[PDB]
Amino acid sequence: GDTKEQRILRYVQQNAKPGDPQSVLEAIDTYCTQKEWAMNVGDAKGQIMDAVIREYSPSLVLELGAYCGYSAVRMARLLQPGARLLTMEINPDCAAITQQMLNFAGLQDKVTILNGASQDLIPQLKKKYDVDTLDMVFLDHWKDRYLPDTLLLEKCGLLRKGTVLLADNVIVPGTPDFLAYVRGSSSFECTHYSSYLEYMKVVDGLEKAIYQGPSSPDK
Ligand SMILES: Nc1ncnc2c1ncn2[C@@H]1O[C@H](CSCC[C@H](N)C(=O)O)[C@@H](O)[C@H]1O
Ligand SMILES: [Cl-]
Ligand SMILES: [K+]
Numbered sequence: 631g632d633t634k635e636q637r638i639l640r641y642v643q644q645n646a647k648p649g650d651p652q653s654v655l656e657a658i659d660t661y662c663t664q665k666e667w668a669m670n671v672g673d674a675k676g677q678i679m680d681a682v683i684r685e686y687s688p689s690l691v692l693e694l695g696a697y698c699g700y701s702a703v704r705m706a707r708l709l710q711p712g713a714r715l716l717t718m719e720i721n722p723d724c725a726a727i728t729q730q731m732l733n734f735a736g737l738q739d740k741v742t743i744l745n746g747a748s749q750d751l752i753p754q755l756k757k758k759y760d761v762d763t764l765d766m767v768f769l770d771h772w773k774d775r776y777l778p779d780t781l782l783l784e785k786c787g788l789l790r791k792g793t794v795l796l797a798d799n800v801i802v803p804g805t806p807d808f809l810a811y812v813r814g815s816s817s818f819e820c821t822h823y824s825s826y827l828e829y830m831k832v833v834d835g836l837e838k839a840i841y842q843g844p845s846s847p848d849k
């Protein structure tokens with residue numbers, strides 16, 4: 631039958647207002663609430679995301695996991711003129727829907743969708759995509775890659791003192807090894823934010839982990 635993704639874009643095109651990102655977000659959340667797709671209702675986590683963007687005003691953001699573009703629209707609508715979101719998405723069909731979603735929102739010029747696995751694209755950011763360091767990273771992809779990809783970002787020199795990591799779904803279904811790492815590491819200062827999931831009626835959360843620079847090269 632019809633995919634969730636094609637139906638979400640359909641609903642937006644039929645109900646939201648072109649070039650009104652807020653209306654696009656609200657349409658996605660309205661439809662996904664009606665369908666009882668708990669992981670696709672983004673307004674609770676979106677309050678936390680918005681606060682992070684408003685406080686830190688990042689010029690260059692990396693997103694891991696685009697899906698249909700909800701979080702890309704959510705962040706890009708608050709980015710300044712000339713700022714940039716790079717979003718990595720392994721599934722080309724999701725990349726395609728995300729592109730259409732951004733076009734409808736009028737935010738396509740602020741976003742570059744990178745089609746591939748985060749583990750393959752991250753090592754290309756420096757030379758192929760001319761990245762110095764990221765101002766913010768939003769982690770929202772496969773749970774078992776949150777910690778590995780954080781370590782990879784570190785190794786590739788893509789984090790600087792002050793880079794803000796914001797990770798979704800750290801409680802449900804959970805990213806406990808990622809949490810133990812950033813909370814235990816002197817290279818990250820961490821804050822936890824609770825975020826509700828409907829239907830399951832559970833308190834998920836997001837973790838903000840601000841990189842402090844690398845640990846001493848010595849013991
Ligand atoms: N290793 C990987 N690299 C890139 N994308 C990945 C990945 N593993 C999974 N994904 C993608 O991660 C996405 C998770 S859902 C993302 C939801 C989105 N951030 C929102 O808030 O609306 C899926 O679209 C999936 O295809
Ligand atoms: Cl984990
Ligand atoms: K900035």
Ligand SMILES: [K+]
Binds near residue numbers: 695769770771773
């Ligand atoms: K996720």
Ligand SMILES: [K+]
Binds near residue numbers: 814817818
């Ligand atoms: K810490």
